[PDB]
Design a protein around this ligand. Structure first.
Ligand SMILES: CNC(=O)c1cc(Oc2ccc(NC(=O)Nc3ccc(Cl)c(C(F)(F)F)c3)cc2)ccn1
Ligand SMILES: CCCCCCCCO[C@@H]1O[C@H](CO)[C@@H](O)[C@H](O)[C@H]1O
Length: 331
């Protein structure tokens, strides 16, 4: 058991192992940057906010900890450490997560500029590779967007969720009851488009403006898609629309690598059943210089029905405690 030191930070007492040096606030929690003497890395230490105040908080704390503990991939956030000052379950009240210090997101690095095609291959390749891994764990991100992408000055990228609707799949904005993993692929298309052009693909002013802009690019639903609409009102409203043909992408993204355009076409199909998967996209000719089928790993999946239970606060609390005590730090 490590030696802890106390320090007032972010309006509370932080209590941390001495490996974590010179805490410096930066930000479900509050965050300090710190220097980890054990590893020599700059890190984010996140003191979780009111983790066991309510059933909802406790449940969310457990889901967060468990998810993070299982994410072990270069292009996805990982847990460097999780600790509590508590010595017993009975004194267990706080949870601190430790990750790499993530000081820049995709926006901080790209800055609204057009990127070179090679540069977009590398960034998009890395998103899809993380996403293959996430999707193999039977997880849907659901809110993938530049701000949820940590990127260092070497353009090395990690998907995370820090916890704008411009990158959201159309079905997510229409509160569709059930989603497939290709909601995230939509988001990737939106991001990819923007990296190539320097402009937000669908900058809607509100909900309806967002869909309008979408349908302008990808067309109104065709007959195949209309047949899959369960809602009689949604069905009958789509039949009220004046048909739009889907724009030819080749002429929306002029001068772009023809392969970038083709991948965009396979990503940004209105029918989510027809969108390319992450694994399929990694094998696309566009990533030829990056693709290695023997280094695009998948996750072992785990039991996410345990997260969706209806339990007592003290039940969630004790389950989160076991997850803290069982943590084994990475290589
Ligand atoms: C300079 N500032 C910082 O360095 C900094 C660091 C922070 O550390 C973080 C701590 C925890 C998380 N939690 C997730 O990311 N949870 C998550 C949920 C669902 C899904 Cl699907 C995923 C997945 F899989 F996509 F990764 C990840 C994110 C960031 C926070 C704020 N600031
Ligand atoms: C008027 C705007 C229409 C938006 C239609 C979005 C179509 C989404 O695609 C749909 O995804 C569903 C949700 O996961 C699947 O169950 C359907 O089979 C699929 O067609």
């Amino acid at each position: 058991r490590p030696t802890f030191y106390r320090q007032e930070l972010n309006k509370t007492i932080w209590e941390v192992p001495e490996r974590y040096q010179n805490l410096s606030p930066v930000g479900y929690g509050s965050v300090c940057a710190a220097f980890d003497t054990k590893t020599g890395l700059r890190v984010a230490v996140k003191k979780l906010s009111r983790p066991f105040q309510s059933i909802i908080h406790a449940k969310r704390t457990y889901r967060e900890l468990r998810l993070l503990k299982h994410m072990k991939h270069e292009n996805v956030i990982g847990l460097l450490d999780v600790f509590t000052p508590a010595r017993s379950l009975e004194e267990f009240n706080d949870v601190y997560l430790v990750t790499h210090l993530m000081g820049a997101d995709l926006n901080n690095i790209v800055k609204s500029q057009k990127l070179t095609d090679d540069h977009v291959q590398f960034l998009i390749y890395q998103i899809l590779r993380g996403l293959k891994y996430i999707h193999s764990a039977d997880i849907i991100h659901r809110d993938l967007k530049p701000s949820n992408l940590a990127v260092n000055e070497d353009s090395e990228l990690k998907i995370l969720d820090f916890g704008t609707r411009w990158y959201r799949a159309p079905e997510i904005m229409l509160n569709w009851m059930h989603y497939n993993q290709t909601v995230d692929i939509w988001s990737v298309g939106c991001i990819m488009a923007e990296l190539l052009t320097g402009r937000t693909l669908f900058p809607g002013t509100d909900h309806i403006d967002q869909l309008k802009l979408i349908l302008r690019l990808v067309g109104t639903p065709g007959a195949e898609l209309l047949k899959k609409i369960s809602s009689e009102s949604a069905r009958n409203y789509i039949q009220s629309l004046t048909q739009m043909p889907k724009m030819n992408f080749a002429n929306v993204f002029i001068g772009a690598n023809p392969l970038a355009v083709d991948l965009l076409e396979k990503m940004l199909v209105l029918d989510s059943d027809k969108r390319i998967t992450a694994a399929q996209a990694l094998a696309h000719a566009y990533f030829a210089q990056y693709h290695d089928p023997d280094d695009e790993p998948v996750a072992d999946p785990y039991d996410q029905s345990l997260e969706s239970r209806d339990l007592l606060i003290d039940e969630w609390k004790s389950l989160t405690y076991d997850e803290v005590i069982s943590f084994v730090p990475p290589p």
